[PDB]
Symmetry: D2
Subunit: 115 residues, 4 copies
């Protein structure tokens, strides 16, 4: 599994469950084409998004929408979207893990490249 995504909720302190996450790859003319997508499991992770064969170097974007989310402590009209754009490079390690921590008016994201 070359690309994994982990989503956490910063106000409830739990995994972000049943959250839709989309992954796009940049096209030649600079369009974003759909690459892979799914919904986070009960541990806030999303596995089997792609395979080693399909995941080649290029520019990818991981998008997470927090609109539906939060009827928890803080709802807001902000409608924040996490947008993580990065370049997959065959030079560094093989496996990537993208983590996103969500709040109503903020979000942080990190990348852990192992193996």
């Amino acid at each position: 599994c070359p690309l994994m995504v982990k989503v956490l909720d910063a106000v409830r302190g739990s995994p972000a469950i049943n959250v839709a996450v989309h992954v796009f790859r940049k096209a030649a003319d600079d369009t974003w084409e759909p690459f892979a997508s799914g919904k986070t499991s009960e541990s806030g992770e999303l596995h089997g998004l792609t395979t080693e064969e399909e995941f080649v170097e290029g520019i990818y974007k991981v998008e997470i929408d927090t609109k539906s989310y939060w009827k928890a402590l803080g709802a807001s009209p902000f409608h924040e979207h996490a947008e993580v754009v990065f370049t997959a490079n065959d030079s560094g390690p093989r496996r990537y893990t993208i983590a996103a921590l969500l709040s109503p008016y903020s979000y942080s994201t990190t990348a852990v490249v192992t193996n």
Copy 2:
């Protein structure tokens, strides 16, 4: 000033100077229309992007070009930019300050409204 941006560098514990920032607004046909852009000052701040009249209601995307910043420092960054999409002025005018904290493999963005 209704829309300000502030960038901090968590590697050298200083403001992020000369960073390029682009702001887009979502068009009726789902495309992203250029709205405003500029670069941060020596204090890491970017003011005067737009005015009260130009900043209408809508879905905006703020892109901070972190890759160029880290490479010009010798670092090997993971991300192309630090981005965040949000809805603004949905209930009349408000003042926004988007603040970003940067590291080679991580970043966060926060909004302070009015």
Copy 3:
């Protein structure tokens, strides 16, 4: 002002007002000696904690009392405070700005030196 503090509330997208902050300095016998304290303003800033002469070289601990802040808003916080320990003025005087971003179950702290 050589030591400033700035706190932001990521839940309501505003500065964190009236937040208590304590600063300690590590004593020769490893105990933590009270150094300065105060509360953030309506802008979420705390200035005038100390002066250039009082702020000597040493290991300081800045504690932001987040629990009291979240409970007074009705939230159920995880942490007692947001804390961070660091070494200061080890190479002559410098100006520090510690900025903190708060959420009920998470927080970050960043330092901007001179």
Copy 4:
């Protein structure tokens, strides 16, 4: 395993390996007594810190020192220490996971309480 600790490196984008992490519990007179400690594994995690029987409600502190760390991209005289103080409550979920993301002049931490 009631209390787990995960440490990540924000400049190298990898798990923080062989990092010493200490856990203290607050004593009656407000002293901090040693509770548990160890060194992060090759995946940046630390397991088997304590047991359900030993981990009762109270105020705990998880400390991580970044002094030795970083002969990686950015070394600094800052000598930052992550200090995560929290109260364990038997009301919320049973398992706690404390995550810490380190940088030379900054750090963020989150808590994920499950089950």
